[PDB]
Amino acid sequence: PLLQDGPPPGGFAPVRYARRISNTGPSAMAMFLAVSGAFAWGMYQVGQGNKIRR
Amino acid sequence: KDWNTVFERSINTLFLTEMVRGLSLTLKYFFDPKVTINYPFEKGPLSPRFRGEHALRRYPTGEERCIACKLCEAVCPAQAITIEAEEREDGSRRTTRYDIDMTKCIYCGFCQEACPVDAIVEGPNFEFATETHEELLYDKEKLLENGDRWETEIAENLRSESLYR
Amino acid sequence: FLDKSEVTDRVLSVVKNFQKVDPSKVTPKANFQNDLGLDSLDSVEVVMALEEEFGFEIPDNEADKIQSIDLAVDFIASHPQAK
Amino acid sequence: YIAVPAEILGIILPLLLGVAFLVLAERKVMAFVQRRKGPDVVGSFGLLQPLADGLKLILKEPISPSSANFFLFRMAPVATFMLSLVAWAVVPFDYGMVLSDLNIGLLYLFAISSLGVYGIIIAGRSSNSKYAFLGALRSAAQMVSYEVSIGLILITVLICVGSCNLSEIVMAQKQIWFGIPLFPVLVMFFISCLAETNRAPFDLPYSSMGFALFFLGEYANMILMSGLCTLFFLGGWLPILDLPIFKKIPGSIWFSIKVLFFLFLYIWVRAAFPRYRYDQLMGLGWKVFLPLSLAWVVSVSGLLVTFQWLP
Amino acid sequence: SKAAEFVISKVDDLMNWARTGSIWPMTFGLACCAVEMMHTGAARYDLDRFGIIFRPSPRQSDCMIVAGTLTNKMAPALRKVYDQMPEPRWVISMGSCANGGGYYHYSYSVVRGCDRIVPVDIYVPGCPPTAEALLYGLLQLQKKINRRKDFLHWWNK
Amino acid sequence: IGVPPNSANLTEARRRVFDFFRAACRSIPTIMDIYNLQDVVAPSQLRYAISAQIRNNAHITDPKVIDLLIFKGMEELTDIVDHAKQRHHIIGQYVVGGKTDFLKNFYTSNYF
Amino acid sequence: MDNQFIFKYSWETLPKKWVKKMERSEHGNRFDTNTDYLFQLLCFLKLHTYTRVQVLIDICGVDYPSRKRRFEVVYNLLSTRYNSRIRVQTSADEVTRISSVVSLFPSAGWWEREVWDMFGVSFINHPDLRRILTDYGFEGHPLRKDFPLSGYVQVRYDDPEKRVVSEPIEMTQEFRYFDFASPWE
Amino acid sequence: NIGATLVGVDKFGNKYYQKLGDTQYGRHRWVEYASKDRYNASQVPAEWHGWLHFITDHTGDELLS
Amino acid sequence: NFTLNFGPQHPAAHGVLRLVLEMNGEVVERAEPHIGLLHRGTEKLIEYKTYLQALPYFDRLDYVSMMAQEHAYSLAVEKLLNCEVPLRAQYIRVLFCEITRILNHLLALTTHAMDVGALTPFLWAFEEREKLLEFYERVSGARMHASFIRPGGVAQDLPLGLCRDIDSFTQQFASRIDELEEMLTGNRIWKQRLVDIGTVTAQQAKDWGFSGVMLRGSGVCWDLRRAAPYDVYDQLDFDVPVGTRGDCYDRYCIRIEEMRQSLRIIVQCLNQMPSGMIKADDRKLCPPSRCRMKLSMESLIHHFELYTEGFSVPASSTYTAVEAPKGEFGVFLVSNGSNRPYRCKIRAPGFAHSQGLDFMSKHHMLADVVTIIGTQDIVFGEVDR
Numbered sequence A: 001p002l003l004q005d006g007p008p009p010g011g012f013a014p015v016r017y018a019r020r021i022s023n024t025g026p027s028a029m030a031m032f033l034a035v036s037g038a039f040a041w042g043m044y045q046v047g048q049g050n051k052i053r054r
Numbered sequence B: 001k002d003w004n005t006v007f008e009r010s011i012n013t014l015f016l017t018e019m020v021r022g023l024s025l026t027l028k029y030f031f032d033p034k035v036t037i038n039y040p041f042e043k044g045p046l047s048p049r050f051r052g053e054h055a056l057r058r059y060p061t062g063e064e065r066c067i068a069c070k071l072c073e074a075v076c077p078a079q080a081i082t083i084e085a086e087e088r089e090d091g092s093r094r095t096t097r098y099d100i101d102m103t104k105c106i107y108c109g110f111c112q113e114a115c116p117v118d119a120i121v122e123g124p125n126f127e128f129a130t131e132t133h134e135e136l137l138y139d140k141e142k143l144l145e146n147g148d149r150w151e152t153e154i155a156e157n158l159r160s161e162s163l164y165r
Numbered sequence C: 001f002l003d004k005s006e007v008t009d010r011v012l013s014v015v016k017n018f019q020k021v022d023p024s025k026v027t028p029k030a031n032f033q034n035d036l037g038l039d040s041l042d043s044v045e046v047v048m049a050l051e052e053e054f055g056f057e058i059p060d061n062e063a064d065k066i067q068s069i070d071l072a073v074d075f076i077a078s079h080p081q082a083k
Numbered sequence D: 001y002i003a004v005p006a007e008i009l010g011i012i013l014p015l016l017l018g019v020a021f022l023v024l025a026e027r028k029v030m031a032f033v034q035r036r037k038g039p040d041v042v043g044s045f046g047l048l049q050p051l052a053d054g055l056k057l058i059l060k061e062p063i064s065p066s067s068a069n070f071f072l073f074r075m076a077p078v079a080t081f082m083l084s085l086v087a088w089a090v091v092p093f094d095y096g097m098v099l100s101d102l103n104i105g106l107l108y109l110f111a112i113s114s115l116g117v118y119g120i121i122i123a124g125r126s127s128n129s130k131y132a133f134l135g136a137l138r139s140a141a142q143m144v145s146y147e148v149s150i151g152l153i154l155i156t157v158l159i160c161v162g163s164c165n166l167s168e169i170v171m172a173q174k175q176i177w178f179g180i181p182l183f184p185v186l187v188m189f190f191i192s193c194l195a196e197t198n199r200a201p202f203d204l205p206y207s208s209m210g211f212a213l214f215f216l217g218e219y220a221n222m223i224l225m226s227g228l229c230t231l232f233f234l235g236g237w238l239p240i241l242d243l244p245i246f247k248k249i250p251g252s253i254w255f256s257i258k259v260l261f262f263l264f265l266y267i268w269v270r271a272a273f274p275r276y277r278y279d280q281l282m283g284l285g286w287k288v289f290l291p292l293s294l295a296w297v298v299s300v301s302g303l304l305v306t307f308q309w310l311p
Numbered sequence E: 001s002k003a004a005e006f007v008i009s010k011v012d013d014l015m016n017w018a019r020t021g022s023i024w025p026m027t028f029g030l031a032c033c034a035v036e037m038m039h040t041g042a043a044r045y046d047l048d049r050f051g052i053i054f055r056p057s058p059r060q061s062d063c064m065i066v067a068g069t070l071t072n073k074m075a076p077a078l079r080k081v082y083d084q085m086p087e088p089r090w091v092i093s094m095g096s097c098a099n100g101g102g103y104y105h106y107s108y109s110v111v112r113g114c115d116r117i118v119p120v121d122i123y124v125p126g127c128p129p130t131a132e133a134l135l136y137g138l139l140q141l142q143k144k145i146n147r148r149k150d151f152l153h154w155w156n157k
Numbered sequence F: 001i002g003v004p005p006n007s008a009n010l011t012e013a014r015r016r017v018f019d020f021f022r023a024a025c026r027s028i029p030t031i032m033d034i035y036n037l038q039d040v041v042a043p044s045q046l047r048y049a050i051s052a053q054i055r056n057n058a059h060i061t062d063p064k065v066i067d068l069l070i071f072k073g074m075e076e077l078t079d080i081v082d083h084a085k086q087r088h089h090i091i092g093q094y095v096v097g098g099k100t101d102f103l104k105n106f107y108t109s110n111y112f
Numbered sequence G: 001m002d003n004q005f006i007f008k009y010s011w012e013t014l015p016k017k018w019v020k021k022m023e024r025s026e027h028g029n030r031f032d033t034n035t036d037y038l039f040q041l042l043c044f045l046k047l048h049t050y051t052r053v054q055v056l057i058d059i060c061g062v063d064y065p066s067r068k069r070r071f072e073v074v075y076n077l078l079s080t081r082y083n084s085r086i087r088v089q090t091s092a093d094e095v096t097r098i099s100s101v102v103s104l105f106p107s108a109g110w111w112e113r114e115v116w117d118m119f120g121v122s123f124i125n126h127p128d129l130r131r132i133l134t135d136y137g138f139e140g141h142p143l144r145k146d147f148p149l150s151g152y153v154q155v156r157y158d159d160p161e162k163r164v165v166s167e168p169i170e171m172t173q174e175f176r177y178f179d180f181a182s183p184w185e
Numbered sequence H: 001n002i003g004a005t006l007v008g009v010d011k012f013g014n015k016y017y018q019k020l021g022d023t024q025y026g027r028h029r030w031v032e033y034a035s036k037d038r039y040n041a042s043q044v045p046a047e048w049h050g051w052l053h054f055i056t057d058h059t060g061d062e063l064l065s
Numbered sequence I: 001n002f003t004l005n006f007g008p009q010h011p012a013a014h015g016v017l018r019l020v021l022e023m024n025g026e027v028v029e030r031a032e033p034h035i036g037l038l039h040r041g042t043e044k045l046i047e048y049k050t051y052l053q054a055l056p057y058f059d060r061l062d063y064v065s066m067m068a069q070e071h072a073y074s075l076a077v078e079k080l081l082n083c084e085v086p087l088r089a090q091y092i093r094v095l096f097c098e099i100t101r102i103l104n105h106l107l108a109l110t111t112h113a114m115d116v117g118a119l120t121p122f123l124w125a126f127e128e129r130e131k132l133l134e135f136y137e138r139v140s141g142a143r144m145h146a147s148f149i150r151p152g153g154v155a156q157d158l159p160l161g162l163c164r165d166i167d168s169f170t171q172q173f174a175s176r177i178d179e180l181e182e183m184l185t186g187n188r189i190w191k192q193r194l195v196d197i198g199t200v201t202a203q204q205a206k207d208w209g210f211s212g213v214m215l216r217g218s219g220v221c222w223d224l225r226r227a228a229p230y231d232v233y234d235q236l237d238f239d240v241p242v243g244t245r246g247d248c249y250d251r252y253c254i255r256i257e258e259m260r261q262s263l264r265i266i267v268q269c270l271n272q273m274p275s276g277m278i279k280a281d282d283r284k285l286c287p288p289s290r291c292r293m294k295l296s297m298e299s300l301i302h303h304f305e306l307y308t309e310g311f312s313v314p315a316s317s318t319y320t321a322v323e324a325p326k327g328e329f330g331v332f333l334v335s336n337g338s339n340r341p342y343r344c345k346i347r348a349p350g351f352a353h354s355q356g357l358d359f360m361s362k363h364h365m366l367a368d369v370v371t372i373i374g375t376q377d378i379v380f381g382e383v384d385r
């Protein structure tokens, strides 16, 4: 009939179709410092524990 | 290139920073609602145009709509329909044999859209798996039983596409 | 080199298996297609039987040259591979 | 002294039940990750599925492939089952809850792990399929190449403890867990255990009980390597480092929790990443892990010696 | 029969329960019905949830779903694969092509039904059958398995 | 390698016939090993079978038809050399093998 | 670039003895050549600067049992540079060997094998001309008009023989041919 | 079956439930079969089959009339 | 060197794949694919059917891209009939062809990733595949084999909510593609298993008859929707992605970009779709309305003749090709003036792609042959008819 399937008046909403970036990270600089500090402090604590065990 | 860039891309090579980004996505999908359905209890959505099990309809007075015109048999691309007809005692044009090979049927709906009296339709039923081959050789009695069993749903669907067909 | 006796026996024995070749006519000098009235298919079948009783091979240019059993038995006696 | 078989049964049968439920847990966790549900019809939440699987593989009326010596083929799964279960006699679950307290436990574990190569090799040759033979040879080479790095990481851990007793390695982490300082070592050990078990991106690959025993041995190896990962780096049965008010929880629960965490990491890693190629497995395992493990051994030994922090 | 009618019944029920709860089909994907089988095992319908997991080799599979057009050149391989599965085995025919030739029934290079090569236990009609139609077919196969009385018949002979 | 160009006379057709027959003869030992035909058939019964086929197709005088026949025979030989065909197929094709014909046909069926 | 330009250019540039029939229409510019000039024509149309046809789309046969030269072999060609399509056709019967074009277009091997399998047309200098689609040991060429739709043989499993066997065809329901042709066409 | 509304009851005793969805749907039209003996996997009459499969919005009690 | 056989009967790799590999060591020296296991005689069966009766055969050729083959067959019939199609029908056909392209690209990408070993993206993609098969199941009555596109116009009109639901789908398909891309594109294992694998030069692609993603990965900017546009494709804005190295990674990136552009085209088709009738007004070639056949004599006569004899195509022959998701899908239709096609060759892109497997895989590892096979997006329904 006169009522036919189609877009509503004014058209549909605009939609994104391109890739969205995602900058989710702890960073290159931060991770190295965190791991190195963990290594140093952990080795110090391991030495303390070894002293107590001795 | 830059020492900063070399350091940045060497850290990402060693710290597996492009795999943590995939682990995070998989984990985020771990804590999420599932989209699986309990098939025996809840069924997937369908459409009124769905082409399932065939059914032969009859008039509300109790007379079968099929007039043995063989117009569905000539359009069937799979040659799955065989019709035998003769003049009934009242002189009406009716079928004596109307059998459909469900093992040849391709469920295209050409027979449904070629019937001039809406006698043969494809109902919403899709759960009719059989344990034997010749139980899939539907005949006139089986098709009429299908039509009587699915009459209300078939009528509602045909009412729905009255605006489209 | 090989002695004439064994090669003559080996060429006189296998030729009697064609269900038409006369045993009385086969001899060290008896042409296949001419003296025995054979067919060209039999003319190549005799050569094939020569390489059916041994593993050596006859090139396609060494089969249609001379259809004589005397030259055939001479060539067989000059076959180092056989014994 | 007749109660030792009771202890062996009590450590063996729950291990098999845990292996079956680990297979179920893997098939459930992958389903949850991929936006579906695992087996749920059989049990209340699928908990009865492994029993149904067991009765199925038992009741199959199968035929023995006697197209071989029939001895090595039949005993290769038995041998790998031997090796997979025998390593659990030394792993401690709490302070005094170890079946066999060896003083050479780390080396005994290394020996048991190195002797696991024969089962797959014998199964590969005994099967007359040449292609299965080549696949078994490749798997054996991979297990070997990563067992080297596993041994080097064991050296890294052993330097900081000073004893091969497994129950003392845990007690050496009372101050802090070894996973905090040696975090790259922990990551390398986990990846090597992934490659050792023929699992994760490192997983390149007959019927009835032979394949059943191989499957059970592989999953028992997975559980054992998760236990080793939590035993050397996560403090074993020791509680959380801070907030010591929950001490009412038995130490055996913490070991179980950490093992379950590592098993979840196995399932997660296998679900999240694609497969490696053989020409890349060997290159990676011989060029990225051997040098790194050797360098970490050198660095840890040099740092401990320099400041006299040795055991 | 004071306990045989009871104990044999219970052990046979246990056997049937195990076999229905753990079915390992071997999907024999041949044509567009393979897409429907992949959709059935995906997240929406979750064929795994009933215990069904597909297998690559016939050594470890107790069911075999033939879903696609069976050609003359492929039938020997079909039969060879079927002959390699262990004894308690079932065959499910999926789609019109596997049932009776389907839309290529009158072709010169099509086997008019997989039941001419292997014995079929369940026929699933459609072209292609709906994924829920395949679920119904597997449920019907389960219902048929529960009808088996292996231990009672063994006792009665 | 490539399909040979079409022949121009009957002599070339005969030469190709002989070449194909020799190729089939050299192919006999390979079939005896690929298929367990050792204790099945003599190494000359097959040779006679190919000879009989060539002889009963020997009334052709068209070189193109002879070339097509040779090509089809070579295709069949190549298929048999490979494991493509089943074992009983060659044994079903390559084996050498009272009132009146009319009355037996009459007793059988009306359609002769 | 277009059918109006390619037609005139090939009318002028091409040697006259090659092409014997030229249609210029919207359905497609066709060339009909003798089977002994096909390779030369396609080599010319593959190398010439203004007719750079570098893609052979497909090779198909058409069966005309009423003609003396029964089979029609069609070469659909595409020129990516000039965005144009050219169709070249030849005619051959059941016992003549036409030249192969695998030398010019390497992809022609499989379509030539398919044409030989479906129609029985043999190609000279084809590296390996064997059936590609039909079953092993298939006898007859199905795409011919005289070949029955259901074929001559049928396949079933023989339990005593313990293998899948081939038997003469026997339909449980024959193909029903419906004659819808009208006398007022 | 918790936080759900019972749409209607069938002649076989089957109960039909419905829940309201917002953006992703899930467990919004299902049946609690009145039987437990394997439930035959197909016991929904024609008047309720359309409602279950989202073919029609009529419940099935309204489809009868 | 020895002779190897990969016949995977399980559809974890196609299903009817038969490769006879000659391997020297771990490398493969030649790959000879044995086809014919799915040759069902489709080409010969077409000659025995009416033009209407032969339409469903094209659904089952490339059964991952159903609407693409129907579009080509319908366009060939219209070309041989000179039948004009209304604008709304053209927009519907373009919309559903792009939906089909998205479906095919999703299935290809994730079935290829599953062969490599990435199990997760497969189910994530089949969720969206189910969502789009819902749209097919709505307009037609079949989820997969929808005989919707027909030579005259389209089979029947759209339901009420289809446009709204497709818009809702397009609102999130971009994020779905983004997640799938995040799983695979940045991963180092995925790069290592595709980069420099299956390299093909542009000259090789042209010589071997490559088309679609296979051809465009080598740098050749050849799209049939822009070189020989059909329907309303010249009124829509979309880019054509082109590769730079020709390896399997460029193929994957182009397959992502093509699916994004198909989303863009779908949005444009939804926004610009006009109103009007969906079939040609020449009822001598299209069925009458069900209300008109039961009320008018000539409409009933047309219905009877169409559904027994069908239309008769004037004697001619032509080749029409469309841009199928796999590549260039062509139909060579020959008509003798009757109601049945005289000859109908189906030019399948997968034929020319599986023919070229021999040279792409030469001197490659055995584990790279599965990636080379999966990057071509081959289904055997079309390879052997």
Ligand SMILES: CCCCCCCCCCCCCCCCCCCC(=O)O[C@H](COC(=O)CCCCCCCCCCCCCC)COP(=O)(O)OCCN
Binding pocket: A035, A036, A039, B013, B014, B015, B016, B019, D179, D184, D185, D186, D187, D188, D190, D191, D200, D201, D265, D269, D284, D288, D292, I188
């Ligand atoms: C509480 C529990 C916490 C979690 C515990 C478990 C941790 C693991 C969790 C899962 C992590 C992801 C697992 C993915 C498994 C497969 C990953 C293998 C990939 C890989 O091997 O990367 C290689 C290089 O990176 C590598 O080398 C990787 C190893 C690097 C180890 C870290 C070394 C850093 C040293 C820094 C020292 C600084 C501190 C001391 C001063 C190849 O990569 P490629 O392809 O580029 O080939 C290099 C050519 N050149």
Ligand SMILES: CCCCCCCCCCCC(=O)SCCNC(=O)CCNC(=O)[C@H](O)C(C)(C)COP(=O)(O)O
Binding pocket: C039, C040, C041, F013, F014, F017, F024, F027, F031, F050, F053, F054, F055, F057, F058, F059, F060, F061, F066, F069, F070, F072, F073, F074, F076, F077, F080, F094
């Ligand atoms: C296991 C092996 C598989 C393959 C086995 C072979 C299967 C196919 C067999 C070939 C079928 C054919 O018809 S292929 C061979 C058909 N070609 C001819 O028959 C040529 C006409 N014959 C003649 O000219 C003469 O009679 C001649 C016989 C040459 C000699 O006689 P002369 O020289 O005196 O003239």
Ligand code: SF4
Binding pocket: B075, B076, B077, B078, B079, B080, B081, B100, B104, B105, B106, B107, B108, B109, B110, B111, B112
């Ligand atoms: S649905 Fe199609 S194939 Fe089935 S009977 Fe009707 S016309 Fe024939």
Ligand code: SF4
Binding pocket: B065, B066, B067, B068, B069, B070, B071, B072, B073, B083, B114, B115, B116, B117, B118, B119, B120
């Ligand atoms: S079902 Fe319809 S089309 Fe078929 S014979 Fe009966 S009235 Fe005619």
Ligand code: SF4
Binding pocket: E031, E032, E033, E067, E068, E069, E094, E095, E096, E097, E098, E102, E103, E126, E127, E128, E129, I060
């Ligand atoms: S039954 Fe239909 S969908 Fe299934 S394989 Fe045959 S033609 Fe394809």
